[PDB]
């Protein structure tokens, strides 16, 4: 009945304590901390208790203990972009943003491809994409799918291109 990181207490449904209620085993996660600006391995029990307690500076990177690589690197780029996202969809341990679909069968945030982006009323950005001298206007979903693809681009300013 109770949500992730929570525990039943006297008909209430309160958060868990990371240092008291996680003496059992749980799978290792790789997590990032905005304050210290370092990532580290953490038990899933402690991480979910922290997110119940609104530790917004703590972000999910990937399942298992930390391994450097592109997937870890992209996890750090997600965190810097997450302030620009209006969707904050819970998805397993992760939180999916405007440029991602929650894959329910795997509990993984999966980056959309650019043509899947619903423009709607998303915030626009003027950008230049590498090896070119022609500005283009992109919304935040589009920008996120491009960074996820590891594609060369530079943002120039918020809002549509003035040209």
């Amino acid at each position: 009945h109770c949500q992730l990181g929570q525990k039943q207490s006297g008909s209430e449904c309160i958060c868990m304590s990371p240092e008291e209620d996680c003496s059992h085993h749980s799978e290792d996660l790789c997590v990032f901390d905005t304050d210290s600006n370092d990532y580290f391995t953490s038990p899933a029990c402690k991480f979910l208790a922290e997110k119940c307690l609104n530790n917004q500076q703590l972000h999910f990177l990937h399942i298992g203990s930390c391994q450097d690589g592109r997937q870890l690197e992209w996890g750090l780029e997600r965190t810097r972009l997450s302030s620009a996202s209006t969707k904050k969809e819970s998805c397993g341990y992760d939180t999916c943003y405007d440029w991602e679909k929650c894959s329910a069968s795997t509990s993984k945030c999966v980056c959309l491809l650019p043509p899947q982006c619903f423009k709607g009323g998303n915030q626009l950005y003027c950008v230049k994409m590498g090896s070119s001298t022609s500005e283009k206007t992109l919304n935040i979903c589009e920008v996120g799918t491009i960074r996820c693809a590891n594609r060369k681009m530079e943002i120039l300013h918020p809002g549509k291109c003035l040209a």
Epitope: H62, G69, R70, Q71, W74, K101, S103, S105, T106, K108, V110, C111, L112, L113, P114, P115, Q116, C117, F118, K119, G120, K136, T137, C148, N150
Partner: antibody, heavy 118, light 113 residues
Framework: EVQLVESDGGLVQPGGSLKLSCAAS????????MAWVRQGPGKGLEWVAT????????YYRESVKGRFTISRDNAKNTLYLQMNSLRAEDTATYYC???????????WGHGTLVTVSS | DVVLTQTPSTLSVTPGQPASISCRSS???????????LYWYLQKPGQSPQLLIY???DLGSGVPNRFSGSGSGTDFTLKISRVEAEDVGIYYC?????????FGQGTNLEIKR
């Protein structure tokens, strides 16, 4: 209900021209990319072109470049495919498609038959 | 161009029985961030294709849950647990992991009687 209705296909002699149209309703047309997909007599499926929201960016299958042009008119809620220098291997049923957050080709029209023949 | 080669090209299934269709890719569809853009479509006779499975194993909207997908890398599989008459048609796999987008040649599903 999302709805896509292709038309302006039909018979065209080889080397002739055709401009397909696809009328969209049931959603905000200018909020989405659009694509054309075709199915030849062998019943294989083949992506043709994609267009971004306002037509400032277009993408094309390599066998089609320099011959087809994807365009749109968001005031009329219509997707187009100009097709020049038509070959017999372009004979197919052409569908317009709209993506979703699940897939690239989520919603499909019923298609318009293009027959290239003398 | 990534070539998707489906197997079998035809299969006959009694209603109520399960069915399995495989899709072999000439190149791995897993990318360097852990995502795999494989999809399954059904084209019933006289109709346009409709989505069944997205991202290997996620079920499309309005699709019955007797359809499932699985696999990784280059080998992927669609499964129908209990076939019904309305599932007759041609089943296609599609990849969007490497441009241009490509489909499989299709697998015909016959109702065995």
């Amino acid at each position: 209900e999302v709805q896509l209705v292709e038309s302006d296909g039909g018979l065209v002699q080889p080397g002739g021209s055709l401009k397909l149209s696809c009328a969209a309703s049931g959603f905000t047309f200018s909020d989405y990319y659009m694509a054309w997909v075709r199915q030849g007599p062998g019943k294989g499926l083949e992506w043709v072109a994609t267009i971004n929201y306002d037509g400032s960016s277009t993408y094309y299958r390599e066998s089609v470049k320099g011959r087809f042009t994807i365009s749109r008119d968001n005031a009329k809620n219509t997707l187009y495919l100009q097709m020049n220098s038509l070959r017999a291997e372009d004979t197919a049923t052409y569908y317009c498609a709209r993506p979703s957050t699940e897939a690239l080709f989520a919603y499909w029209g019923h298609g318009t038959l293009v027959t290239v023949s003398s | 161009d990534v070539v998707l080669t489906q197997t079998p090209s035809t299969l006959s299934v009694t209603p109520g029985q399960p069915a399995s269709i495989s899709c072999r890719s000439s190149q791995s569809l897993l990318n360097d961030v852990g995502n795999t853009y494989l999809y399954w479509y059904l084209q019933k006779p006289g109709q346009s294709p409709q989505l069944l499975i997205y991202l290997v194993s996620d079920l499309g909207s309005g699709v019955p849950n007797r359809f499932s997908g699985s696999g990784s890398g280059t080998d992927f599989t669609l499964k129908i647990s209990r076939v019904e008459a309305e599932d007759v048609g041609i089943y296609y796999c599609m990849q969007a992991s490497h441009a241009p987008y490509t489909f499989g040649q299709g697998t015909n599903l016959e109702i065995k009687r």
